[PDB]
Amino acid sequence: PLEIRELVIKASVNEQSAIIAACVEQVLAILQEKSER
Amino acid sequence: PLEIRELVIKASVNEQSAIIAACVEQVLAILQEKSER
Amino acid sequence: PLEIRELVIKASVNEQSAIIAACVEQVLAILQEKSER
Amino acid sequence: ALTKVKLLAYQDKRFENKLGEFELPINPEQFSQSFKVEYNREQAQGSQRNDPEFKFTKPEELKLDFTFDGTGVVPVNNGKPGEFHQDVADQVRVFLDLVYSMNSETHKPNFLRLIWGDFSFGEKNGFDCLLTDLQINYTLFDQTGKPLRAKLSTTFTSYVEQNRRVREEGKQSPDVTHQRKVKAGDTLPLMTHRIYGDPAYYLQIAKVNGLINFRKLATNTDLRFPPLEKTQ
Amino acid sequence: VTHQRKVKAGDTLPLMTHRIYGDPAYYLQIAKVNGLINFRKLATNTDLRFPPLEKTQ
Amino acid sequence: DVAATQVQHPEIVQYYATDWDFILSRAEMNGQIVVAQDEKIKVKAPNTSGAPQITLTYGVNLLELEAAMDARHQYQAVKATSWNYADQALVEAEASEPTVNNQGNLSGRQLAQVIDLSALELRHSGLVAEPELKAWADAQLLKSRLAKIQGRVKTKGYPDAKVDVLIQLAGVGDRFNGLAYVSGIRHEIVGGAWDTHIQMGLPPQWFYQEVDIIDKPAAGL
Amino acid sequence: IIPRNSLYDVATFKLLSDGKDITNDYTVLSITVNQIVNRVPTARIILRDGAAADETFAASEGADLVPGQEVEIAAGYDGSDQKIFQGLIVKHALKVTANGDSMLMLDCRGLATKLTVGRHNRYFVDTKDSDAIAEIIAQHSLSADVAATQVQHPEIVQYYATDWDFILSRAEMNGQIVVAQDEKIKVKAPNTSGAPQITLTYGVNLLELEAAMDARH
Amino acid sequence: KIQGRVKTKGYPDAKVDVLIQLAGVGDRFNGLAYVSGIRHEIVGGAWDTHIQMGLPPQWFYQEVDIIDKPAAGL
Amino acid sequence: IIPRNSLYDVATFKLLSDGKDITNDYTVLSITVNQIVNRVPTARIILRDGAAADETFAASEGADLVPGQE
């Protein structure tokens, strides 16, 4: 993302972190685009 | 979804595409329902 | 979540349910926090 | 004299209040121990090789197999003539009560210590642990149904308390005070580099010890090196 | 739950309190529950009661 | 089934709005809640004075648990002000400390001193009388105190679950133990399994701050 | 980027609470800190806690991690740490998940959050925006550093709004930005006239990169 | 005009409201960039930083609701 | 749905930029097009680019894919 507050916070210490990040850029792009004329 | 602008865009060409789609219908249903009285 | 209407509805009967729940608390926390000054 | 493996069961997490002990009737043929360290392995793009960063050390693992036999051909190590092992169920019962069942006062299983005579695991003579895995196989039975042979396989994990862990890691850093004696060939910036990693602090050190001329040191002076301030 | 203990040779009140509650600091309460005037010299046939703790503090 | 109020109004106007929205606005401004079920609608004050129904203990009964405090929603005092043209002066009312259930060992007044705002102030330029300003300020303080601690608990199937009752929560430390107020319930039956979720506490925001219940200018033409 | 004269590359941090160092008294799992322009600094701390056999949360019952305390966070390489964050604990939460893991989470905010908890009404007559901003800041016992403006207004009105919102509106209408940290608030024009601090090269230093243009703005 | 985000390893001397030089990305993005925000993350012993460049184009008042409702919501 | 008199079912596409066909000059990964009533038509194009050894983005520096072109 182009923002730092839209990054996912990491809470675990013992080891799929690159799928909870791809499934977050997709939702924010589906949701932002929904606001333009 | 019942809309075409709520579909997830596919950007890869070499091969879990059916989990980034189920985790997007769930969020939109949790979020829409949050707006009705 | 602290709410009952923010819980994901379960529709299947034959068997990854703990990844569609972690990828939903992350989006709602990224989205709520985006509204405070 | 033949020595036997012993398992000591404690209630206290400091291993002071002993509850019981169990002794193996037959020593195992072998056992295994496992170690591991964890590093960070991210790399810059278009770079040849890398220099990984340290994250942490994981607890050690221990694997053990042994046998109970009651058909009357294995002698009992008590010195009496004509004595052989003939009761498997009693041993299984006391073993399971000691290492597996829940304690009624703590609401969890007991803490274990493993000892084999003069064996040494490292810098210690015992293994402090908890049971994580167990399997039993019954392979021979009496005509009334009572067993004559059992084989057991167990997996243990290492356990050590917080207070004691931070004392075993005797972390020495610029967080403490140092003391050094001046010997032939010493200079102040080199000593400062060897303690702090940076010579630039030398002018401060000279002020702490009252040195008028710090380019000619005497060879019986004891110098103090204070810690650094917690946040800069 | 409630505990009951008999005093034998070598016993002291703070050590018994530690062995039941895990903390000696409760000893002054225990002496009051059993009516002990001097709690630094115990007799060797006394049965002491140890009540449970309050459910939420 | 509507509990009676004491303030009598010279006039009330429902202007181009839905019945549900009008009812909820007028109910919240009096410190009451709405419960709808079985062809029946009940409007009344929250039931925080009863006896607990069950005990839920961490380490005995629970499958999942969440709980939270937030100090920024607590206030020390509330004031409401308006203009009285018969006297040509301002009128002011102050809220009273409400009586709620006991949970934890930190009071709302202690948490209210983190930000340390002297008092919250509400203002209206129209003719609002003394008793209406008083009810408004009281509702605001009650809103703030009932949201001190919020949480959610998951356990196995519980047929006798009900909302608007008290339960006892235990096994979670001095700061969360005590009597909690149930706000909602979910039952889930999937493939033969049955479990329930119990929500405790109320949200701190007003109803009108979350929904759009007024039309657009020019009727959107 | 790695500081010069680092003999070992072990990264260290320090968490002080009311002046007391409590780093090695608990089990710390993660720390996150955010410093953004025109926003209030934020920090989040995750510790391990909870035990079903004891039926309590031991660090929750302590007196070091309760709302209202001063928190200071520093970090660095090889034992030489630098101050990063200073603020207050606001939120205090517990969590036990499906598989039995249990943790305690803390949420800390800067001191400027004192400006966002009420609505006020004020008049100002024959002043500048810088004077109104300095006065509103100083009333909260915070240090102000406000660059002066040249336009003098016959009147300014703060109508039923929060201090933070009034300040940000008046700052943006003059082309200035707000930076808040360390009991200090600075209002000034963006610093686009300086010298570069470092060089970041793709293929040398970077781990990830995103960039975008849009012609419609 | 241009907005972006960069992730690199732990950088103790990071600061906002300064300039950095960005290189290696083509003629259309190279040059001096203005830093708007910083995040530090320490998880399990690892340390990395994120640097945000550029400002958003929307006004402050267009993103938040800073005015009350008619009739004070009564 | 498949057009009649199709001897092979190989699907093809063409991308013109200011009248010039640039399909086979770059590596094209994906194309998406949306036509909806009461909205403005939209298209999104994804190409492969970037090389760490060369330290540049070659198609970005070209003159065929800059904002403002047809």
PDB file of C-alpha atoms in Angstrom, chain G:
ATOM      1  CA  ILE G   1      22.050   2.435   7.371  1.00  0.00           C
ATOM      2  CA  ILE G   2      23.679   0.222  10.012  1.00  0.00           C
ATOM      3  CA  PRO G   3      25.499   2.564  12.430  1.00  0.00           C
ATOM      4  CA  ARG G   4      29.273   2.733  12.017  1.00  0.00           C
ATOM      5  CA  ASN G   5      31.411   1.165  14.809  1.00  0.00           C
ATOM      6  CA  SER G   6      28.924  -1.599  15.572  1.00  0.00           C
ATOM      7  CA  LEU G   7      30.937  -4.654  16.586  1.00  0.00           C
ATOM      8  CA  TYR G   8      27.892  -6.929  16.796  1.00  0.00           C
ATOM      9  CA  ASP G   9      24.530  -6.536  15.085  1.00  0.00           C
ATOM     10  CA  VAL G  10      22.271  -7.622  17.953  1.00  0.00           C
ATOM     11  CA  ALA G  11      19.260  -5.301  18.113  1.00  0.00           C
ATOM     12  CA  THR G  12      18.090  -4.177  21.549  1.00  0.00           C
ATOM     13  CA  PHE G  13      15.248  -2.139  23.035  1.00  0.00           C
ATOM     14  CA  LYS G  14      14.138  -0.731  26.390  1.00  0.00           C
ATOM     15  CA  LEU G  15      10.681  -0.147  27.858  1.00  0.00           C
ATOM     16  CA  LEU G  16      10.427   2.246  30.802  1.00  0.00           C
ATOM     17  CA  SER G  17       7.259   2.795  32.835  1.00  0.00           C
ATOM     18  CA  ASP G  18       7.179   5.800  35.177  1.00  0.00           C
ATOM     19  CA  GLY G  19      10.965   5.838  35.010  1.00  0.00           C
ATOM     20  CA  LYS G  20      11.403   2.169  35.941  1.00  0.00           C
ATOM     21  CA  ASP G  21      12.910  -0.285  33.462  1.00  0.00           C
ATOM     22  CA  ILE G  22      10.541  -3.248  33.160  1.00  0.00           C
ATOM     23  CA  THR G  23      11.968  -4.934  30.057  1.00  0.00           C
ATOM     24  CA  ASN G  24      13.143  -8.154  31.726  1.00  0.00           C
ATOM     25  CA  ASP G  25      10.238  -8.505  34.172  1.00  0.00           C
ATOM     26  CA  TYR G  26       7.726  -9.751  31.579  1.00  0.00           C
ATOM     27  CA  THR G  27       7.667 -11.738  28.345  1.00  0.00           C
ATOM     28  CA  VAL G  28       7.550  -9.252  25.462  1.00  0.00           C
ATOM     29  CA  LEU G  29       6.421 -10.523  22.067  1.00  0.00           C
ATOM     30  CA  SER G  30       6.111  -7.493  19.795  1.00  0.00           C
ATOM     31  CA  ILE G  31       6.388  -3.697  19.587  1.00  0.00           C
ATOM     32  CA  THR G  32       5.126  -1.325  16.876  1.00  0.00           C
ATOM     33  CA  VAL G  33       5.566   2.465  16.689  1.00  0.00           C
ATOM     34  CA  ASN G  34       4.070   4.965  14.205  1.00  0.00           C
ATOM     35  CA  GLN G  35       5.148   8.591  13.648  1.00  0.00           C
ATOM     36  CA  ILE G  36       3.110  10.330  10.935  1.00  0.00           C
ATOM     37  CA  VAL G  37       2.720  13.985   9.945  1.00  0.00           C
ATOM     38  CA  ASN G  38      -0.575  15.666  10.942  1.00  0.00           C
ATOM     39  CA  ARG G  39      -1.462  12.776  13.277  1.00  0.00           C
ATOM     40  CA  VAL G  40      -0.913  11.732  16.875  1.00  0.00           C
ATOM     41  CA  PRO G  41       1.952   9.274  17.538  1.00  0.00           C
ATOM     42  CA  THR G  42       0.925   5.726  18.374  1.00  0.00           C
ATOM     43  CA  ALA G  43       2.452   2.578  19.851  1.00  0.00           C
ATOM     44  CA  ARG G  44       1.230  -0.976  20.406  1.00  0.00           C
ATOM     45  CA  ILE G  45       2.741  -3.586  22.741  1.00  0.00           C
ATOM     46  CA  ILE G  46       1.986  -7.327  22.865  1.00  0.00           C
ATOM     47  CA  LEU G  47       2.980  -9.461  25.875  1.00  0.00           C
ATOM     48  CA  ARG G  48       2.404 -13.115  26.727  1.00  0.00           C
ATOM     49  CA  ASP G  49       0.110 -13.712  29.663  1.00  0.00           C
ATOM     50  CA  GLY G  50      -2.580 -16.005  31.041  1.00  0.00           C
ATOM     51  CA  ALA G  51      -2.547 -19.474  32.582  1.00  0.00           C
ATOM     52  CA  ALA G  52      -5.536 -21.793  32.829  1.00  0.00           C
ATOM     53  CA  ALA G  53      -4.123 -23.760  35.762  1.00  0.00           C
ATOM     54  CA  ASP G  54      -3.750 -20.633  37.908  1.00  0.00           C
ATOM     55  CA  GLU G  55      -6.994 -18.994  36.704  1.00  0.00           C
ATOM     56  CA  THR G  56      -5.626 -15.455  36.597  1.00  0.00           C
ATOM     57  CA  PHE G  57      -3.679 -12.936  34.523  1.00  0.00           C
ATOM     58  CA  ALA G  58      -0.653 -12.071  36.632  1.00  0.00           C
ATOM     59  CA  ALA G  59       0.759  -9.108  34.702  1.00  0.00           C
ATOM     60  CA  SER G  60      -2.705  -7.602  34.339  1.00  0.00           C
ATOM     61  CA  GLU G  61      -3.012  -7.493  38.138  1.00  0.00           C
ATOM     62  CA  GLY G  62       0.307  -5.658  38.467  1.00  0.00           C
ATOM     63  CA  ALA G  63       0.856  -1.938  38.881  1.00  0.00           C
ATOM     64  CA  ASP G  64       3.124  -1.278  35.890  1.00  0.00           C
ATOM     65  CA  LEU G  65       0.726  -1.651  32.942  1.00  0.00           C
ATOM     66  CA  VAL G  66      -2.463   0.133  33.996  1.00  0.00           C
ATOM     67  CA  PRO G  67      -4.041   3.028  32.062  1.00  0.00           C
ATOM     68  CA  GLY G  68      -2.650   6.447  32.885  1.00  0.00           C
ATOM     69  CA  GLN G  69       1.063   5.706  33.206  1.00  0.00           C
ATOM     70  CA  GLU G  70       3.942   7.286  31.319  1.00  0.00           C
ATOM     71  CA  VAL G  71       5.606   4.971  28.798  1.00  0.00           C
ATOM     72  CA  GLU G  72       8.951   5.546  27.101  1.00  0.00           C
ATOM     73  CA  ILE G  73      10.423   3.299  24.407  1.00  0.00           C
ATOM     74  CA  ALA G  74      14.003   3.331  23.114  1.00  0.00           C
ATOM     75  CA  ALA G  75      15.787   1.074  20.641  1.00  0.00           C
ATOM     76  CA  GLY G  76      19.100   0.615  18.895  1.00  0.00           C
ATOM     77  CA  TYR G  77      21.905  -1.751  17.956  1.00  0.00           C
ATOM     78  CA  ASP G  78      24.324  -3.499  20.285  1.00  0.00           C
ATOM     79  CA  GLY G  79      23.166  -1.835  23.501  1.00  0.00           C
ATOM     80  CA  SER G  80      23.269   1.815  22.363  1.00  0.00           C
ATOM     81  CA  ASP G  81      19.629   2.890  22.347  1.00  0.00           C
ATOM     82  CA  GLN G  82      17.843   6.055  21.234  1.00  0.00           C
ATOM     83  CA  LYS G  83      14.529   7.435  22.443  1.00  0.00           C
ATOM     84  CA  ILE G  84      11.702   6.650  20.020  1.00  0.00           C
ATOM     85  CA  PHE G  85       8.376   7.101  21.799  1.00  0.00           C
ATOM     86  CA  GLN G  86       6.951   8.912  24.826  1.00  0.00           C
ATOM     87  CA  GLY G  87       3.280   8.752  25.722  1.00  0.00           C
ATOM     88  CA  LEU G  88       0.501   7.382  27.910  1.00  0.00           C
ATOM     89  CA  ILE G  89      -1.321   4.057  28.128  1.00  0.00           C
ATOM     90  CA  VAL G  90      -4.952   4.455  27.059  1.00  0.00           C
ATOM     91  CA  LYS G  91      -6.305   0.960  26.362  1.00  0.00           C
ATOM     92  CA  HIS G  92      -5.881  -2.321  28.249  1.00  0.00           C
ATOM     93  CA  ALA G  93      -7.201  -5.582  26.810  1.00  0.00           C
ATOM     94  CA  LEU G  94      -7.102  -9.365  27.232  1.00  0.00           C
ATOM     95  CA  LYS G  95      -7.413 -12.047  24.576  1.00  0.00           C
ATOM     96  CA  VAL G  96      -7.599 -15.842  24.450  1.00  0.00           C
ATOM     97  CA  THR G  97      -7.890 -17.358  20.990  1.00  0.00           C
ATOM     98  CA  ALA G  98      -9.244 -20.623  19.630  1.00  0.00           C
ATOM     99  CA  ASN G  99      -6.131 -22.759  20.097  1.00  0.00           C
ATOM    100  CA  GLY G 100      -5.523 -21.605  23.673  1.00  0.00           C
ATOM    101  CA  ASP G 101      -2.849 -18.930  23.257  1.00  0.00           C
ATOM    102  CA  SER G 102      -3.375 -15.961  25.562  1.00  0.00           C
ATOM    103  CA  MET G 103      -1.862 -12.488  25.494  1.00  0.00           C
ATOM    104  CA  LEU G 104      -2.150  -8.972  26.894  1.00  0.00           C
ATOM    105  CA  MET G 105      -2.244  -5.964  24.573  1.00  0.00           C
ATOM    106  CA  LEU G 106      -1.455  -2.333  25.383  1.00  0.00           C
ATOM    107  CA  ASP G 107      -2.247   0.762  23.326  1.00  0.00           C
ATOM    108  CA  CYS G 108      -0.276   3.961  23.929  1.00  0.00           C
ATOM    109  CA  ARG G 109      -0.866   7.435  22.515  1.00  0.00           C
ATOM    110  CA  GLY G 110       1.072  10.676  22.591  1.00  0.00           C
ATOM    111  CA  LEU G 111       0.190  13.540  24.876  1.00  0.00           C
ATOM    112  CA  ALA G 112      -1.571  15.477  22.114  1.00  0.00           C
ATOM    113  CA  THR G 113      -4.561  13.173  22.619  1.00  0.00           C
ATOM    114  CA  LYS G 114      -5.531  15.535  25.427  1.00  0.00           C
ATOM    115  CA  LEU G 115      -6.670  17.921  22.682  1.00  0.00           C
ATOM    116  CA  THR G 116      -9.335  15.626  21.195  1.00  0.00           C
ATOM    117  CA  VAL G 117     -11.825  15.046  24.014  1.00  0.00           C
ATOM    118  CA  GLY G 118     -14.304  17.921  24.048  1.00  0.00           C
ATOM    119  CA  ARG G 119     -16.069  20.783  22.315  1.00  0.00           C
ATOM    120  CA  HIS G 120     -15.347  24.430  23.114  1.00  0.00           C
ATOM    121  CA  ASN G 121     -16.414  27.949  22.134  1.00  0.00           C
ATOM    122  CA  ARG G 122     -14.076  30.941  21.844  1.00  0.00           C
ATOM    123  CA  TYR G 123     -13.684  34.437  20.415  1.00  0.00           C
ATOM    124  CA  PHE G 124     -10.494  36.050  19.153  1.00  0.00           C
ATOM    125  CA  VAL G 125     -10.333  39.705  18.110  1.00  0.00           C
ATOM    126  CA  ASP G 126      -7.616  41.429  16.049  1.00  0.00           C
ATOM    127  CA  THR G 127      -5.148  38.549  16.202  1.00  0.00           C
ATOM    128  CA  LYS G 128      -3.375  36.224  13.786  1.00  0.00           C
ATOM    129  CA  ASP G 129      -3.803  32.486  13.361  1.00  0.00           C
ATOM    130  CA  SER G 130      -0.420  31.870  14.973  1.00  0.00           C
ATOM    131  CA  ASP G 131      -1.492  33.641  18.164  1.00  0.00           C
ATOM    132  CA  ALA G 132      -4.756  31.718  18.488  1.00  0.00           C
ATOM    133  CA  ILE G 133      -2.933  28.436  17.886  1.00  0.00           C
ATOM    134  CA  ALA G 134      -0.192  29.213  20.403  1.00  0.00           C
ATOM    135  CA  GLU G 135      -2.745  30.172  23.052  1.00  0.00           C
ATOM    136  CA  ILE G 136      -4.906  27.076  22.567  1.00  0.00           C
ATOM    137  CA  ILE G 137      -1.821  24.857  22.803  1.00  0.00           C
ATOM    138  CA  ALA G 138      -0.405  26.576  25.882  1.00  0.00           C
ATOM    139  CA  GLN G 139      -3.655  26.116  27.798  1.00  0.00           C
ATOM    140  CA  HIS G 140      -2.920  22.358  27.900  1.00  0.00           C
ATOM    141  CA  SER G 141       0.564  22.780  29.445  1.00  0.00           C
ATOM    142  CA  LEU G 142       2.343  21.780  26.233  1.00  0.00           C
ATOM    143  CA  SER G 143       5.205  23.599  24.549  1.00  0.00           C
ATOM    144  CA  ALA G 144       4.338  25.388  21.312  1.00  0.00           C
ATOM    145  CA  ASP G 145       6.561  26.316  18.365  1.00  0.00           C
ATOM    146  CA  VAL G 146       4.419  28.214  15.853  1.00  0.00           C
ATOM    147  CA  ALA G 147       5.772  30.006  12.799  1.00  0.00           C
ATOM    148  CA  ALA G 148       4.229  33.437  12.373  1.00  0.00           C
ATOM    149  CA  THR G 149       1.621  34.380   9.777  1.00  0.00           C
ATOM    150  CA  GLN G 150       1.150  37.768   8.141  1.00  0.00           C
ATOM    151  CA  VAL G 151      -2.645  38.053   7.811  1.00  0.00           C
ATOM    152  CA  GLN G 152      -4.379  39.805  10.704  1.00  0.00           C
ATOM    153  CA  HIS G 153      -8.041  38.961  11.197  1.00  0.00           C
ATOM    154  CA  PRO G 154     -10.696  41.266  12.652  1.00  0.00           C
ATOM    155  CA  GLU G 155     -12.272  38.230  14.332  1.00  0.00           C
ATOM    156  CA  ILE G 156     -11.943  34.450  14.641  1.00  0.00           C
ATOM    157  CA  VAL G 157     -14.652  32.212  16.112  1.00  0.00           C
ATOM    158  CA  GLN G 158     -14.313  28.677  17.479  1.00  0.00           C
ATOM    159  CA  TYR G 159     -17.862  27.319  17.366  1.00  0.00           C
ATOM    160  CA  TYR G 160     -18.672  24.092  19.210  1.00  0.00           C
ATOM    161  CA  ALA G 161     -15.710  22.050  18.029  1.00  0.00           C
ATOM    162  CA  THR G 162     -12.613  20.291  19.307  1.00  0.00           C
ATOM    163  CA  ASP G 163      -9.256  22.011  19.783  1.00  0.00           C
ATOM    164  CA  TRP G 164      -7.481  19.573  17.466  1.00  0.00           C
ATOM    165  CA  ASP G 165      -9.934  20.201  14.628  1.00  0.00           C
ATOM    166  CA  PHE G 166      -9.795  23.983  14.939  1.00  0.00           C
ATOM    167  CA  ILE G 167      -5.991  23.939  14.922  1.00  0.00           C
ATOM    168  CA  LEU G 168      -5.735  21.647  11.900  1.00  0.00           C
ATOM    169  CA  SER G 169      -8.281  23.632   9.885  1.00  0.00           C
ATOM    170  CA  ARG G 170      -6.545  26.945  10.521  1.00  0.00           C
ATOM    171  CA  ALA G 171      -3.120  25.425   9.857  1.00  0.00           C
ATOM    172  CA  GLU G 172      -4.057  23.894   6.507  1.00  0.00           C
ATOM    173  CA  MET G 173      -5.654  27.119   5.292  1.00  0.00           C
ATOM    174  CA  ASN G 174      -2.220  28.775   5.653  1.00  0.00           C
ATOM    175  CA  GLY G 175      -0.149  26.071   3.970  1.00  0.00           C
ATOM    176  CA  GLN G 176       1.447  24.698   7.142  1.00  0.00           C
ATOM    177  CA  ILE G 177       1.839  21.294   8.795  1.00  0.00           C
ATOM    178  CA  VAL G 178       1.667  20.050  12.386  1.00  0.00           C
ATOM    179  CA  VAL G 179       4.280  17.803  14.014  1.00  0.00           C
ATOM    180  CA  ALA G 180       3.689  16.629  17.582  1.00  0.00           C
ATOM    181  CA  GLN G 181       6.214  14.812  19.773  1.00  0.00           C
ATOM    182  CA  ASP G 182       8.026  14.865  23.136  1.00  0.00           C
ATOM    183  CA  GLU G 183       5.656  17.293  24.910  1.00  0.00           C
ATOM    184  CA  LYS G 184       6.124  19.704  21.999  1.00  0.00           C
ATOM    185  CA  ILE G 185       3.962  20.794  19.069  1.00  0.00           C
ATOM    186  CA  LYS G 186       5.483  22.478  16.008  1.00  0.00           C
ATOM    187  CA  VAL G 187       3.492  24.253  13.292  1.00  0.00           C
ATOM    188  CA  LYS G 188       5.459  25.300  10.230  1.00  0.00           C
ATOM    189  CA  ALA G 189       5.778  25.123   6.471  1.00  0.00           C
ATOM    190  CA  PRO G 190       7.066  21.879   4.913  1.00  0.00           C
ATOM    191  CA  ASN G 191      10.846  21.502   4.781  1.00  0.00           C
ATOM    192  CA  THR G 192      11.584  20.933   1.092  1.00  0.00           C
ATOM    193  CA  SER G 193      14.744  23.059   0.822  1.00  0.00           C
ATOM    194  CA  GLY G 194      17.298  20.953   2.714  1.00  0.00           C
ATOM    195  CA  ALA G 195      20.044  18.426   1.836  1.00  0.00           C
ATOM    196  CA  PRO G 196      19.440  14.670   1.548  1.00  0.00           C
ATOM    197  CA  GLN G 197      20.160  12.430   4.517  1.00  0.00           C
ATOM    198  CA  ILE G 198      20.784   9.057   2.824  1.00  0.00           C
ATOM    199  CA  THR G 199      20.557   7.365  -0.561  1.00  0.00           C
ATOM    200  CA  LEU G 200      18.172   4.449  -1.110  1.00  0.00           C
ATOM    201  CA  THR G 201      18.985   2.455  -4.247  1.00  0.00           C
ATOM    202  CA  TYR G 202      16.927  -0.341  -5.762  1.00  0.00           C
ATOM    203  CA  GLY G 203      19.259  -3.287  -6.139  1.00  0.00           C
ATOM    204  CA  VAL G 204      21.422  -2.214  -3.189  1.00  0.00           C
ATOM    205  CA  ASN G 205      19.424  -1.347  -0.068  1.00  0.00           C
ATOM    206  CA  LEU G 206      15.730  -1.989  -0.613  1.00  0.00           C
ATOM    207  CA  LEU G 207      13.509  -4.837   0.501  1.00  0.00           C
ATOM    208  CA  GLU G 208      10.202  -3.537  -0.886  1.00  0.00           C
ATOM    209  CA  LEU G 209       9.054  -0.638  -3.031  1.00  0.00           C
ATOM    210  CA  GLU G 210       5.857   0.998  -4.276  1.00  0.00           C
ATOM    211  CA  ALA G 211       5.385   4.254  -6.188  1.00  0.00           C
ATOM    212  CA  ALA G 212       2.602   5.914  -8.147  1.00  0.00           C
ATOM    213  CA  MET G 213       1.614   8.951 -10.210  1.00  0.00           C
ATOM    214  CA  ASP G 214      -1.903  10.189 -10.921  1.00  0.00           C
ATOM    215  CA  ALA G 215      -2.561  12.948 -13.438  1.00  0.00           C
ATOM    216  CA  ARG G 216      -6.053  13.885 -12.227  1.00  0.00           C
ATOM    217  CA  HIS G 217      -4.830  15.768  -9.138  1.00  0.00           C
TER     218      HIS G 217
END
